[PDB]
Write an enzyme that holds these catalytic residues in place. Sequence first.
Site, mmCIF file in Angstrom:
data_model
loop_
_atom_site.group_PDB
_atom_site.id
_atom_site.type_symbol
_atom_site.label_atom_id
_atom_site.label_comp_id
_atom_site.label_asym_id
_atom_site.label_seq_id
_atom_site.Cartn_x
_atom_site.Cartn_y
_atom_site.Cartn_z
ATOM 1 N N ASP A 1 39.301 14.912 -19.368
ATOM 2 C CA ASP A 1 40.597 15.486 -19.690
ATOM 3 C C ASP A 1 41.531 15.349 -18.495
ATOM 4 O O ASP A 1 41.096 15.347 -17.339
ATOM 5 C CB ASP A 1 40.456 16.957 -20.086
ATOM 6 C CG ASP A 1 41.688 17.494 -20.790
ATOM 7 O OD1 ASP A 1 42.682 16.748 -20.907
ATOM 8 O OD2 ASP A 1 41.662 18.663 -21.229
ATOM 9 N N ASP B 1 34.294 22.048 -24.161
ATOM 10 C CA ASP B 1 33.835 20.722 -23.774
ATOM 11 C C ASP B 1 32.321 20.580 -23.820
ATOM 12 O O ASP B 1 31.813 19.499 -23.500
ATOM 13 C CB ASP B 1 34.336 20.383 -22.369
ATOM 14 C CG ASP B 1 35.826 20.122 -22.331
ATOM 15 O OD1 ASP B 1 36.273 19.143 -22.962
ATOM 16 O OD2 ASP B 1 36.550 20.896 -21.672
ATOM 17 N N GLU C 1 0.809 -1.216 0.000
ATOM 18 C CA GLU C 1 0.000 0.000 0.000
ATOM 19 C C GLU C 1 0.846 1.271 0.000
ATOM 20 O O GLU C 1 0.550 2.214 -0.741
ATOM 21 C CB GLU C 1 -0.948 -0.019 1.196
ATOM 22 C CG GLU C 1 -2.356 -0.484 0.862
ATOM 23 C CD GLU C 1 -2.592 -1.937 1.211
ATOM 24 O OE1 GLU C 1 -1.703 -2.550 1.834
ATOM 25 O OE2 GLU C 1 -3.669 -2.463 0.866
ATOM 26 N N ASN D 1 -0.196 -4.124 6.834
ATOM 27 C CA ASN D 1 0.605 -3.510 5.781
ATOM 28 C C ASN D 1 1.116 -2.138 6.200
ATOM 29 O O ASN D 1 2.273 -1.792 5.937
ATOM 30 C CB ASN D 1 -0.209 -3.407 4.494
ATOM 31 C CG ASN D 1 -0.258 -4.713 3.732
ATOM 32 O OD1 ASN D 1 0.385 -5.689 4.113
ATOM 33 N ND2 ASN D 1 -1.025 -4.739 2.651
#
Length: 888
Positions: A340, A621, A298, A710
Amino acid sequence: EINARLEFAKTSTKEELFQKFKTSNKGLSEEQVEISREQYGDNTITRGKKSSLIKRLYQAFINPFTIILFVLALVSAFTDIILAAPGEKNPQGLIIITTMVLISGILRFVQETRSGNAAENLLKMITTTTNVHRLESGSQEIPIEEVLVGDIIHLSAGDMVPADLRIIQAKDLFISQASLTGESEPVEKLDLATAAAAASITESVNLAFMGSNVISGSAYGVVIATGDATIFGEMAKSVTEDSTKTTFEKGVNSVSWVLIRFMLVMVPFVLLINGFTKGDWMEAALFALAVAVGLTPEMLPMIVTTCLAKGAVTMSKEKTIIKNLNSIQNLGSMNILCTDKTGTLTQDKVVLMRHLDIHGQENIRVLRHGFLNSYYQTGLKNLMDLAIIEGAEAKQDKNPELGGLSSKYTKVDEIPFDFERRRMSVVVKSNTNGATSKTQMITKGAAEEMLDICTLVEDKGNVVHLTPELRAYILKKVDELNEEGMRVILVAQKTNPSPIDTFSVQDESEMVLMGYLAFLDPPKESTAKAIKALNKYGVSVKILTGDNDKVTRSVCKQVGLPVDKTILGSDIDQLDDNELAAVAAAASVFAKLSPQQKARIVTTLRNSGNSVGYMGDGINDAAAMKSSDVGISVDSAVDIAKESADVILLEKDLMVLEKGIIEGRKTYANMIKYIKMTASSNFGNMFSVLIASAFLPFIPMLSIHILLLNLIYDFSCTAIPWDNVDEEYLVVPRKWDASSVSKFMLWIGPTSSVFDITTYLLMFFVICPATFGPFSSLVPGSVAYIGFIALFHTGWFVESMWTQTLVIHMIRTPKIPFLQSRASAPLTILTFMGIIGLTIIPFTSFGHSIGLMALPINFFPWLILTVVMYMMLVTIFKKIFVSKYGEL
Ligand SMILES: [Mg+2]
Ligand SMILES: [Mg+2]
Ligand SMILES: [Mg+2]
């Protein structure tokens, strides 16, 4: 339209523009800012999509799980309120299910709002800023989204242009428009009102468009268009499902569909069994509703949101600031890392400098010219320029030649760095001699490119002509210096340069060469360990450098990466994509790369299915960062690198990236662990109810008890994101799976089904008859019958809760549950509190209010024996499952 206004902006004078836009030279005013906001627009990008609050909420409310919960609510309301007999109304279940529906919908809406794609900045943990001048607040930095039409903006080196700008004051402004039109060549921008019909406005003189990058110089611009009205806004297009990644939303939907499949298999079976066996259809409906409620995890969205929030907060605390919730999924599945070498592997500081003459002897004049170029450079300052400045300042104490260079000289013109030429030129004029001061061009760049424009060389205090023999000797010396790992730079001068009205790239010729500049860039002490740790987690590190291959090879020799195979840019240019994939997958070092070559390599690696992430911090870049699945930068990087990056780090190192990857994988590991555990636990109980439905004379447990079970179980399992995770699970990247959950349920649930049947038998034959009397001799409808049913329900309730909580330790770890791998403190303590609280629940009056009865003392030893005998069976079945499939 918008275009007609752009022509006026690019053609009007500064004062007419100021009068029209109600903008003064010192910025905008509050009332005019409000008027512009309510008239012109807001600097937010819709990307071709727009949704209001009501539409967004309605769209988020119809996820499959919320539909499941709504169907459960409808069935419960029909069974307990409308179709129930008069006098017996139980709105508790309907109320709690409706509240849970609302909670799940709100959580789904929050997740949808905070989840994006393609490095979308939705969390707003970090926001880029631009310098904006205002009448009252002066010069302040504000987020890009707060820029309105008419604002005066100051542009510096590296700052991304935040809107369509008409430059009113430009000082050698060079703009990299590659991010917009694909041209990697900087374009000079002036402040003159050009009355010429330029081609398609894009390549005009006095307009700076959104998304373009500033390389050098400082300029003041007036915003003329924001939001979708700009060229970048039109180019902003939403590519739905651009990546094939399986986000957490798709996994949750798949889990919900698995639950629907199991419900369709099981619930009609129970309904048919009861209706055709016992003859009372109301009891069949009650059993079907009970099974449907039990099968549902649930509070699944609550745990999912808790996991995502914990992951985000933990990564933020680990110096890893993310941009959205999908960033965790993107980073967890990292397979190949490309970056790099500068800044990442090597510390960004020079420890040894050599300002050498032509023959390699220490010289001061070359250092003076290099210092002039570096100090009077207006663009971004790299490590080499900073080292030049520090060395020149240090040597000023004893050398009178270097004294006072920062005050007696003035820059008049400059050509910025570009990867197609790899040189930088600055024109310097003396400030202490007036008009007759004489102007001196100074050029700095790589040796190979700098040897193609020089025709004279300053040797032994005199200038000589440049023969091919001297060029070969210079190249030999440069290569010899590059052998040890030093970065080599040549410096040249020219006098007199062409006038600034005609000073262009064509003017760089016939320069006289001073000498070299050698900088030593040592790698960090922790680089090797970080690289080994990254390679342990399946993340291969590849390097995409633009420097000489010898220096990269020297760095890789110390770090530990392979050096036998090195690939240059020309080879990649001359070889096709099909061979490129193999040659890139089989290599680790790439050198002499142009930015487009880096983007091509990243795209080729990504084409083979490898999840490739790019690390970068420069303007050039941006293509590689946009072409990679994941984008990583630093908080000190340029605005374009930060904007295009999926993840931003506060420190430029590899250990932080490794910790971020570990956390990203841990989040999914814990989420899938909880999902599988709860799914199997629910399936076992519901299969038990299915089997024992035709044999039991009453309901094994009410719907309210199942819902409370639950709820308490999920409130005890909310501590999953804080448990230990096996290293073998985190070593490899993981992708979302759906059929694995089904296999886990089918292979684990029936183990608990047998013991739930055993508990049914024990309670119906041993304990409850001993407390109340035999059931066959019990008249229905009496108080004793109610007590019998309540005792049975309470017994199975407590047994089920204990089983569900205590199977957590056994199921979670594929190794020995206690001797080899241990659960964390928070999950254990929270589970224990849940167990104790629920066990106190039946004894209190609240339990008696919903149909629970106090358990007898004799029941507990049976509960302990059942738990132990269940644990042994769970261990056996876990061993079988591990042998069959290999993972849990
Ligand atoms: Mg800035
Ligand atoms: Mg110029
Ligand atoms: Mg159970």
